[PDB]
Amino acid sequence: NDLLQQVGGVGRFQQIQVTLVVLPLLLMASHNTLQNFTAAIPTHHCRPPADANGLEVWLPRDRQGQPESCLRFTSPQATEPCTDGWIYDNSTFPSTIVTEWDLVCSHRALRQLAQSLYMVGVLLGAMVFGYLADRLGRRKVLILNYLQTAVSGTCAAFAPNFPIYCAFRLLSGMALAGISLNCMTLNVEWMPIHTRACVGTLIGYVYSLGQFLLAGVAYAVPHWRHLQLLVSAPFFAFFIYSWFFIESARWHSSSGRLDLTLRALQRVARINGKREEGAKLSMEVLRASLQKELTSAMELLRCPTLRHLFLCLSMLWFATSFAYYGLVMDLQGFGVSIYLIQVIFGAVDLPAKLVGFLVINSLGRRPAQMAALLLAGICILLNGVIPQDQSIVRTSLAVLGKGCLAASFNCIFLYTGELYPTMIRQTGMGMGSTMARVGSIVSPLVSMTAELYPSMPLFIYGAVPVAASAVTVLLPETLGQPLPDTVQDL
Numbered sequence: 001n002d003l004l005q006q007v008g009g010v011g012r013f014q015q016i017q018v019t020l021v022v023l024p025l026l027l028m029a030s031h032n033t034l035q036n037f038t039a040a041i042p043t044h045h046c047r048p049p050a051d052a053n054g055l056e057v058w059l060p061r062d063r064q065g066q067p068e069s070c071l072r073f074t075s076p077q078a079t080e081p082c083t084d085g086w087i088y089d090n091s092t093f094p095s096t097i098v099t100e101w102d103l104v105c106s107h108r109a110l111r112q113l114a115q116s117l118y119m120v121g122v123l124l125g126a127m128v129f130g131y132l133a134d135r136l137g138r139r140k141v142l143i144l145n146y147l148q149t150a151v152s153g154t155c156a157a158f159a160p161n162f163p164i165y166c167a168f169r170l171l172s173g174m175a176l177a178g179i180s181l182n183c184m185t186l187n188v189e190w191m192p193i194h195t196r197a198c199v200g201t202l203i204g205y206v207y208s209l210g211q212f213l214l215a216g217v218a219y220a221v222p223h224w225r226h227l228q229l230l231v232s233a234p235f236f237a238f239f240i241y242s243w244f245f246i247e248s249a250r251w252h253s254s255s256g257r258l259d260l261t262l263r264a265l266q267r268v269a270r271i272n273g274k275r276e277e278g279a280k281l282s283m284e285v286l287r288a289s290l291q292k293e294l295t296s297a298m299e300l301l302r303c304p305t306l307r308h309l310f311l312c313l314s315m316l317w318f319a320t321s322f323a324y325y326g327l328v329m330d331l332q333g334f335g336v337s338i339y340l341i342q343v344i345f346g347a348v349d350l351p352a353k354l355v356g357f358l359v360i361n362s363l364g365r366r367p368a369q370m371a372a373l374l375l376a377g378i379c380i381l382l383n384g385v386i387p388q389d390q391s392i393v394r395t396s397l398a399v400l401g402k403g404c405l406a407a408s409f410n411c412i413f414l415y416t417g418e419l420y421p422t423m424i425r426q427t428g429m430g431m432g433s434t435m436a437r438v439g440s441i442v443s444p445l446v447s448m449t450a451e452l453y454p455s456m457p458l459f460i461y462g463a464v465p466v467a468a469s470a471v472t473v474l475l476p477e478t479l480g481q482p483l484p485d486t487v488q489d490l
C-alpha cells in the first residue's frame with residue numbers, strides 16, 4: 001500500500017479510471033428493475049370475435065364494473081377462453097413484453113419468470129466472473145462483461161419470442177453481476193487503504209442515482225424495445241473505453257507476475273506526474289515491499305463458531321434482498337404514476353443511507369439491522385392489510401419500508417465484515433452477497449402467489465424481515481469493538 005503512495009496516492013489515475021469504472025453502475029439499477037417498465041401490465045381485457053357485427057355484449061364485468069381480463073362471452077348477451085387474444089390499452093404503455101407475446105391471465109406468471117431468470121444469471125455471474133477475474137484479471141473480465149451486456153441486452157431488445165428474451169436476460173444479468181463485482185475490486189485495489197470505504201459508498205449512491213435515470217429514460221421511451229436497447233447500448237461505449245484501463249498491480253503480485261506490478265505502478269506514476277518516485281522504484285523494491293503479502297467456504301460449515309455467524313447472517317442478507325425486490329418489482333397498484341414512485345423510491349434511499357449511518361454509530365450496529373428490518377417487515381405487512389382505495393397510505397408505508405431495506409443493505413455490508421474474522425471475512429461476505437441474490441431469484445417466484453391470494457406475496461415479504469429481525473439478536477454487538485483476526489476472538 002505504501003508503494004501506491006509512492007507512485008502517488010489517490011492520483012489522477014485514481015480520479016480518471018475510478019469515474020469510468022463506476023459509470024456503468026448507473027445502468028445496473030435500470031437493468032435489474034427494468035421490467036417494471038419493459039414488462040409493465042397495461043389494462044387488458046379480451047378481444048371479441050370479428051364475426052360480431054362494442055364490448056358491452058361480449059365481455060363479462062367484475063365487481064368494479066370493468067371488462068374482465070380472462071374471459072369473454074360465448075354468445076351475444078356462458079363465458080369462454082379468449083381465442084383471438086386481448087385488447088390492451090395504448091395509453092401509458094404502447095408496447096411491453098406482456099402486450100408483445102401475451103403474458104396475461106394463464107400466462108400471468110411468465111412475466112415474473114423472466115425476472116427470476118435474469119436473477120439466476122446474476123447469481124451465476126458472481127461465481128463465474130469471480131473465478132475468471134482471479135485467473136485472467138479484473139480488467140480483462142470487465143472488458144468481456146461490457147461487451148456481453150451490450151450484445152445480449154441488444155439481442156433481448158430484438159428477441160423474436162419470449163424464450164430467446166429470457167436467455168438473453170440471463171446472459172445480461174450474468175455480465176452485470178461480473179460488473180458489480182469487479183468494479184469495486186478494480187476500484188479498491190488501486191486506491192489507498194483509508195479511502196476504501198469511500199469507494200464502496202460512492203458505488204452504493206451511484207446505484208441509487210440510477211433509479212432517477214431509469215424513470216426519465218422509460219418516460220422518454222416507453223416502448224419496451226427502444227427502452228431495453230437504450231439501457232444496453234451505452235455498454236458498447238464502456239467496452240471501448242475499458243481497453244485503456246490499467247490492470248490491478250495487486251493481482252499481478254499475487255498471481256505472480258511481479259514484473260507487471262512494476263509497469264502497472266510506473267504508468268500510474270506517469271499519469272499522477274510523480275514519475276521520479278516510480279523511477280526510483282525497481283524490482284528490488286517490490287521483492288521486499290510485498291514480500292509478506294505475496295508470501296474456504298467449507299470452513300464456515302465446519303466450524304460451529306463460524307456456522308453460527310453464517311446461518312444467522314445468511315438470513316439477514318436473504319430477507320433484506322427478498323423483501324426489497326418484493327416491494328420494488330410492483331410499482332403498479334400504488335395508485336399513482338409508475339414513474340413518479342421510481343423517483344420517490346430512489347429519493348428515499350438517500351436520506352435512508354444517512355439516518356441508517358446515524359443509528360449505526362449512535363445506537364450501534366446490531367440495533368440497526370433489527371430496527372431497519374422490523375420496520376421494513378411491519379410496513380410491508382400493512383400494505384397487504386390496508387385497502388387499495390387508500391393509495392397515499394400504501395405509497396407512504398411502501399416508501400418507508402423500501403428506505404428501511406436500503407438502510408438494511410448498508411448495515412449488513414458493514415456488520416457482516418465486523419462479525420467474521422480476517423481469515424474468512426472476504427469469503428463469508430461473498431457468501432452473504434450470494435444469499436442476497438438467492439433472495440432476488442425467490443422474490444418473483446413469491447409474486448406468482450398473487451394468483452392464489454392477491455395479498456399473499458405482501459404477507460410473505462412482510463413476515464420474512466420480521467423473522468430476520470429476531471435473528472440479529474442471536475449475533476453479538478460490534479460497536480466500538482476491534483476487528484477479529486481468529487475464530488477464538490470474541
Ligand SMILES: Cc1nnc(SCC2=C(C(=O)O)N3C(=O)[C@@H](NC(=O)Cn4cnnn4)[C@H]3SC2)s1
Pocket residue numbers: 028180181200203204205207208406409410413433436437
Ligand atoms: C449493485 C451493487 N452491488 N454491490 C453493491 S455494494 C453497495 C450496497 C448497496 C447500496 O445501496 O448501498 N446495495 C444495493 O443496491 C443492494 N444490493 C442489490 O441491489 C443487489 N446486490 C446484492 N449484493 N450485491 N448487489 C445493496 S448491496 C450494498 S451495490
